[PDB]
């Protein structure tokens, strides 16, 4: 409640490339903690849809071809979400131009890489959450990840959750923290 937490998932590809959001992710997500969920990419699987709705009072699906983008504002930050499959981090000027069309400080896109990535460029913040199911690419395995955006005033703290295999074979959830602060 006192925190404003956005759950960001993308490129689920259920049931065409994956069967389910990994249980070790579901065990971390509980009702009453997430304020809003953005799902990048289509979502046609009834069980996944029902589960996501149980986790937040506000589920927004941003699809392939039913919204084409979504902007959310909290505090002084303006966060844009889109699918943007042709967008790649190796072309930050193309991503920046997209952020400038939406007039957002943070641009989140579910790029065809299916890999978590984030970077800063010209006082803006760019986030690809990867695939929450680890769904393979058409374009080194893909690894499941999702993000939480914790928005406080002019700051966004990004928490990246990733399911990674230890040397002994076990998949465990790792988490990394990145902070963006909008410059004055």
């Amino acid at each position: 409640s006192m925190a404003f937490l956005i759950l960001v998932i993308g490129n689920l590809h259920i049931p065409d490339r994956a069967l389910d959001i990994p249980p070790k992710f579901k065990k971390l997500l509980s009702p009453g903690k997430i304020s809003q969920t953005l799902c990048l990419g289509n979502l046609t699987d009834r069980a996944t849809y029902d589960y996501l709705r149980s986790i937040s009072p506000d589920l927004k699906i941003v699809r392939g071809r039913l919204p084409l983008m979504q902007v959310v504002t909290h505090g002084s930050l303006r966060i844009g979400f889109l699918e943007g499959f042709t967008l790649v981090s190796e072309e930050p000027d193309v991503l920046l131009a997209e952020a400038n069309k939406l007039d957002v400080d943070v641009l989140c896109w579910a790029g065809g890489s299916h890999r978590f990535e984030c970077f800063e460029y010209m006082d803006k913040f760019f986030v690809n959450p990867g695939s929450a199911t680890g769904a393979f690419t058409t374009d080194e395995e893909v690894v499941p990840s999702f993000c939480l955006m914790d928005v406080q005033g002019i700051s966004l703290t990004l928490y990246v959750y990733q399911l990674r295999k230890d040397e002994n074979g076990t998949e465990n959830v790792a988490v990394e923290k990145v902070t963006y602060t909008k410059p004055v």
């Binding site: 925190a3 997500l29 903690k33 928490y159 988490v175 923290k177």
Partner: peptide, 12 residues
């Protein structure tokens, strides 16, 4: 010291 929002880990 602190945790991520979901309580998975204190950070180191």
């Amino acid at each position: 010291x602190g945790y991520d929002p979901l309580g998975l880990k204190y950070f180191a």
